[PDB]
Each structure stands twice: as structure tokens, then as C-alpha cells.
Design a protein around this ligand. Structure first.
Ligand SMILES: [Ca+2]
Ligand SMILES: [Ca+2]
Ligand SMILES: [Ca+2]
Ligand SMILES: [Ca+2]
Ligand SMILES: [Ca+2]
Lengths: 225, 225
């Protein structure tokens, strides 16, 4: 079938070496959207930050923050699918006996909890988190304490439902392990030249570029630009 | 709202300490089905084996073999969602330089490949497998070489579409790591008392029993019997 929607990992694929947004990626997105593609952004950052990207970059589909746990829709509303009461409590307790600590953007989180942590405390905190029904991983600017199942697969399935699409009509763009949840779905897949080996191995198209420059080549490959 | 379908992993949930099918679990399933529940079974077994369970145990919904890659439907047909050409070829070449070997039941597989292997060769084979977009893990009666994404979540999502259900209308019952994919969906979740700590931590109801005895209690808890 033909690709009608592309779900893209913001931090993993739309930024350069210094985490700045790629202007070439922005123009590729706008070009593809003008030709009819619906684009959705997926990020671990907070919803007002992803909302800023939606209104300034010119994204025509819903955008997700907190790794899929919260969404800003095209009707201008915000819907969250998970709560941060449990994850916030966990951080509060864990910060008393480990280096796990809150980050400024948590003041805008609603469905999960971001944090910083010393590498030495990662294994212990992960064990404690999983024993409570949570998971931890790094993305973008920080670690993320998420509810099990609050991931990119949840978000992509939600987009599929919202647009009444088949999996083969969806293209996902990611770069690493924290994207495998959506890369393991029956969707179309593409990634940058610096994507992990496992992500490349399941991708339909592996770009010769990275740091935002893969967006244009990927879209061209699928005749979206 | 109300549970309309239960997706149950066979190994470790419908089986006892000797890997034998639990008669109490069978009767609980039949009782719940008479009251309106649709039940689907999933396992790593080949399709004629899960078909045997469907007709002899009296399962009223579809059954999945090969960890979700092949299904026996209610119209009496078999539908496979992945192919075993690549996985069979992988085994053929790996068997020439490692201890990886085919198993008897592969004569009935259609969407993946089962195998035996010396434990020390697992790392070598997994690395090769993932570079080809496959994964390996042990469950049930052998190791399984699967296509990435060919799992129980793929099967539960298909059931959701087939029965036009909402995730909240689906109950999943599992106990091992290869069952976690189901627990990452926004469904209702339950498990036996001896399920993994991670599965217990994300379940809505953790039974006091195991080895098949949990089915009745779980069903009673969700008002299904
Ligand atoms: Ca990523
Ligand atoms: Ca990247
Ligand atoms: Ca971030
Ligand atoms: Ca079998
Ligand atoms: Ca199991």
C-alpha cells in the first residue's frame, strides 16, 4: 500500500550533533506534507515542547510527548493516557537513597517522570522500577521512568486507530533501541546511517545520511517528496 | 468495561508442574465460554498442535501457534502472517558451523523455525540472527527463531481487530518473559502466582494459584464465571 503517515522520533532523527533541529529535515517535512503526507512527531520531552515544534515546524498530525504517554491533537486538545502519580512517588523515594534526581522539565510532565542518575545507580534503580511496573531508558535530554507499555508502539497504534489506517500505510523513522517498539510493528521502516545494527536489520530503507539529512532521502525513496 | 475475550498463553498457565494440561483449567474455560466469553489460546507450538487443543479442549476463538505467527480461525482456515523461508535458511547455514539443529516439529512449521542448541553457542547465534532481523528465545519445548515482531502482541492486536474490540475488553493471561509483549498492550492483565516478578508487577490481578488453578480464580475475579 501507499504511505499516508510518518511517525518520527524527534530527538533521534530530527537533530544534529549538538541537538539542534535540522533545517533540512524541517524543509523535507514541509515538502512531504504539501504533497499529502501526514506527519506525527514522537518525543520523550514534555507536551508544551512538542506542541512548540508542532506549531513552529508546521506539523500536520498529532504530536506525542513523554514517549507516547501524552498527545496534542489536531482539535487543539491534550489527552494523556497514563499518570505520573506512581512514577513521581517512585522518584521521590529513590532520590533519598540513590543519585536519582528530578529534572526541571518534570514541572510540565503529566504521564511519566524524567530524571538524571549516576551510571553506577542505573542497575539498582532499573530493578526497583521494574518491580513496581515501570521501566527506565534514556532518550533526548534525560532518563525516563515510564509505565510499562507507555511507548512508541502505543503511540503508533493510536495514530493507526485515529486515521483508520493499515500498518503498511504507516512509515516509522527511528534510530536506536528506544524505537524498537515501533520498529517491531508491521509498519514500513526507515533509519539513518548511524542507526543501531538491530534497527537497520529490520528497516525497509537505511539512509546514507544522519542528523536530519536522512529525512529527505527517506521521503524521496518512498516517493513522498 | 466488560471483558469479552481472553487471550491465554498455554505454557505455564494451562499446564502443571509436569507440563501436562490442567483439567481444572479446561473446565474453567468451558464454563466461562458457556457464559459468553470468547477464548483464544497462544503458544510456540505448531499449528496442528494448537488446532488439537482448540478442538479437544473446546476453544471458541482463534488459536495461534508459532508465538503468534500462524493462526487457526473459526471458519476452519489457517492463516500465516510470516514466512519460514528465511529462518529455515538461517538454521540450514548455522547448523554447518555451530551446534544449532532442527527439531522434529519443524516438519509442521510454516512461519518460523524451532531449534536445539548448546547453551554456549546461543550468543554467537543470537548475534547472527539479529543481524538478519530475527530473534531467538527459549519457550515451551525448544528454542524459537522468529521474525522480529512475530509475537503475542501481534496476535492480540489481530484478535482486537477481528472482534472489533477495545483493549479494555480484552484480558490477557501469561507468566513468562515471552508473554510480556501482551502485557505491554493497554489490556486487562492477569497471571498465576508463579509468574515472573515483572509480569506480576504489571498485572491487574495476580492469582494465589498456579499450574492451571489460577484460571478459575482469575475468571471469577473478572466476573466471567
Ligand atoms: Ca530513538
Ligand atoms: Ca540519533
Ligand atoms: Ca527529552
Ligand atoms: Ca509443537
Ligand atoms: Ca508462558
Amino acid at each position: 500500500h501507499m504511505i499516508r503517515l510518518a511517525a518520527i522520533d524527534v530527538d533521534g532523527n530530527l537533530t544534529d550533533r549538538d541537538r539542534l533541529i535540522s533545517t533540512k529535515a524541517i524543509e523535507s517535512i514541509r515538502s512531504a506534507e504539501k504533497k499529502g503526507l501526514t506527519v506525527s512527531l514522537l518525543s520523550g520531552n514534555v507536551i508544551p515542547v512538542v506542541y512548540a515544534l508542532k506549531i513552529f515546524l508546521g506539523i500536520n498530525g498529532p504530536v506525542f510527548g513523554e514517549n507516547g504517554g501524552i498527545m496534542f491533537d489536531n482539535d487543539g486538545s491534550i489527552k494523556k493516557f497514563f499518570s505520573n502519580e506512581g512514577t513521581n512517588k517512585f522518584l521521590e523515594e529513590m532520590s533519598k537513597r540513590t543519585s536519582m534526581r528530578s529534572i526541571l522539565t518534570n514541572r510540565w510532565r503529566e504521564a511519566s517522570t524524567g530524571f538524571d542518575i549516576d551510571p553506577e545507580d542505573v542497575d539498582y534503580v532499573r530493578k526497583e522500577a521494574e518491580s513496581r511496573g515501570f521501566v527506565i531508558f534514556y532518550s533526548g535530554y534525560s532518563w525516563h521512568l515510564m509505565n510499562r507499555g507507555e511507548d512508541k508502539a502505543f503511540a503508533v497504534n493510536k495514530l493507526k486507530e485515529m486515521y483508520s489506517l493499515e500498518y503498511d500505510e504507516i512509515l516509522v523513522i527511528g534510530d536506536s533501541n528506544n524505537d524498537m517498539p515501533m520498529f517491531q510493528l508491521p509498519v514500513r521502516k526507515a533509519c539513518p546511517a548511524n542507526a543501531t545494527d538491530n534497527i537497520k536489520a529490520v528497516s525497509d530503507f537505511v539512509s546514507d545520511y544522519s542528523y536530519g539529512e536522512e529525512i529527505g532521502q527517506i521521503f524521496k525513496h518512498f516517493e513522498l517528496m
